[PDB]
């Protein structure tokens, strides 16, 4: 039976499973730093799980048959077009920032429920606590308006405080010329059109807001490229880490229960992302919306509810 008051009363509690390494860690940094590699290695060396970075298709991949969907069904935004033509009169910039915040929030929730039902800690990439750097960069560069910025901050205020922050925040520090070199080497005709001004605004946002804001409630670990790539140092630092100064000690079985309900209900997560503030950059018209929704429901495995689509191999639909 579903999780609820009854399960928590019967024994599906939380504190019976918080073994050390039942933590949640972030591996933030600039764009082309070794986050994926380092995070996979940390996950392996600590037994924890890895949740890769979340992009425009995270929901399309986590829901349904798992395959992606057209961008009009998932996002109507494009990082390629953002790198090619920012300042566009379309809205791709903020229409992408908002969708990416939403996907990072859905991911934070999908990780918290896993961590609370199972003591298996999780390791993520950039989260809802750092998504805003790519927004401040665009605002200081002129790709976005203060109205979009205020809308973003409002949704952040409505969403973030209802969630527990990370235990450990690893910041891989790297400078902008090395970043540009790494971009040119990796190879992307669009990422290779980005600007060192944008990259430096990202770095400055990080060092001036994220680090201070987060060193007061979670253990920070700042490393450079060469301390990174020698991870065992990082892993042993984490293992030695002291875990005070956070709210995770003010939490009892029942706070965990009332947080697990939220994290398990994937609509009270986004109710506030779905507020009707009418920005010309996300305000979709009725005709477009109706067309897109009816086509989405025309697609397979999406017309009815999960266990009620025979066209994908569902039987007993007349008794469930």
């Amino acid at each position: 039976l579903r999780y609820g008051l009854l399960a928590a009363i019967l024994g599906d509690k939380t504190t019976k499973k918080l073994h050390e390494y039942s933590r949640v860690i972030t591996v933030d940094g600039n764009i082309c730093s070794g986050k994926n590699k380092l995070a996979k290695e940390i996950a392996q060396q600590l037994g924890m799980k890895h949740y890769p970075e979340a992009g425009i298709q995270y929901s399309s991949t986590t829901t349904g048959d798992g395959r992606p969907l057209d961008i009009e069904f998932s996002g109507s935004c494009s990082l390629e077009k953002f790198y090619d033509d920012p300042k566009s009169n379309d809205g791709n910039s903020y229409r992408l920032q908002s969708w990416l915040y939403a996907s990072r929030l859905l991911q934070y929730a999908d990780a918290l429920e896993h961590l609370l039902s199972t003591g298996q800690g999780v390791v993520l990439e950039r989260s809802i606590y750092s998504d805003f750097v790519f927004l401040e960069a665009m605002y200081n560069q002129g790709y976005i308006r203060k109205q979009c910025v205020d809308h973003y901050n409002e949704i952040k205020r409505l969403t973030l405080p209802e969630y527990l922050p990370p235990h450990a925040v690893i910041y891989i520090d790297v400078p902008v010329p090395e970043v540009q070199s790494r971009i040119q080497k990796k190879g992307d005709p669009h990422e290779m059109k980005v600007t060192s001004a944008y990259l430096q605004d990202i770095e400055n946002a990080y060092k001036k807001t994220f680090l201070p804001k987060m060193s007061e409630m979670c253990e920070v670990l700042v490393y450079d490229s060469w301390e990174a790539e020698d991870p065992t140092k990082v892993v042993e630092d984490i293992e030695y880490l002291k875990y005070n100064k956070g709210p995770w000690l003010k939490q009892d079985d029942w706070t965990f229960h009332y947080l697990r309900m939220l994290v398990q209900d994937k609509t009270e997560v986004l109710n506030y992302t779905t507020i009707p503030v009418y920005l010309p950059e996300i305000t979709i018209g009725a005709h477009q919306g109706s067309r897109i929704y009816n086509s989405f429901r025309e697609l397979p495995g999406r017309k009815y509810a999960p266990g009620y689509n025979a066209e994908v191999g569902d039987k007993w639909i007349w008794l469930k």
């Binding site: 409505l158 506030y272 009707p276 009418y278 010309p280 305000t283 018209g285 009725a286 005709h287």
Partner: protein, 39 residues
Amino acid sequence: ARQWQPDIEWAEQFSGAVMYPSKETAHWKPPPWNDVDIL
């Protein structure tokens, strides 16, 4: 042509604290979406 559907101009008139703001004492502003005031 096609059916006319409301626009931002038509939907933002239901977005104030109260409708019919013919008052001049109604300096109010919409409440929060989560009932947590700003401080």
